[PDB]
């Protein structure tokens, strides 16, 4: 009458602090995206932000500098479908 093989919950990790932070959630930016302005953001925070400025004006833009560009068809610094094994 027993079942459940859960590995040790040692989520401890020894690494340096993070410098790249998200101007939205202000938490952390490990795999942020790149825009035509330079400022990075979360692949999610960006999607949500865009909607925000959709009911007021309609068009989205950098929530930091609000530069002129296309929030669609944007690619990050590096996009490779290669996962180390
Ligand atoms: Zn974020
Ligand atoms: Zn910007």
Are the CB atoms for 60 and 50 separated by under 8 Å?
Answer: yes
Domain count, the chain: 1
Distance 2 CA to ligand 1 centre (A): 41
d(CA 21, CA 44): 14
Tokens representing 38 are 């330079």
Distance 20 CA to ligand 1 centre (A): 11
Ligand lying closest to the C-alpha of residue 71: 2
Q: Could you tell me the CATH number of the domain that includes residue 68?
A: 3.30.40.10
Are the CB atoms for 69 and 37 separated by under 8 Å?
Answer: yes
> Sign of dihedral through CA atoms 4, 8, 12, 15?
negative
Distance 36 CA to ligand 2 centre (A): 8
Are the CB atoms for 39 and 62 separated by under 8 Å?
Answer: yes
Listed residue (35, 39, 34) closest to 65, CA to CA: 39
Are the CB atoms for 76 and 33 separated by under 8 Å?
Answer: yes
Domain with 18 in it: 1-85
Distant-in-sequence contacts of 2-6, Cβ < 8 A, 24+ apart: none
42 by Cβ neighbours in 10 Å (0-12 / 13-18 / 19+) ranks as buried
d(CA 35, CA 14): 31
Distance 6 CA to ligand 1 centre (A): 30
Query: How determined?
Result: NMR
Phi, psi of 22 (to 5 degrees): -85, 125
């Amino acid at each position: 009458g027993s079942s459940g093989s859960s590995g040790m919950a040692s989520g401890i990790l020894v690494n340096v602090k993070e410098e790249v932070t998200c101007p939205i959630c202000l938490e952390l930016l490990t795999q942020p995206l790149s825009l035509d302005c330079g400022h990075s953001f979360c692949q999610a925070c960006l999607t949500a932000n865009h909607k925000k400025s959709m009911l007021d004006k309609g068009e989205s833009s950098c929530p930091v500098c609000r530069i002129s560009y296309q929030p669609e068809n944007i690619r990050p610094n590096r996009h490779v479908a290669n996962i180390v094994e």
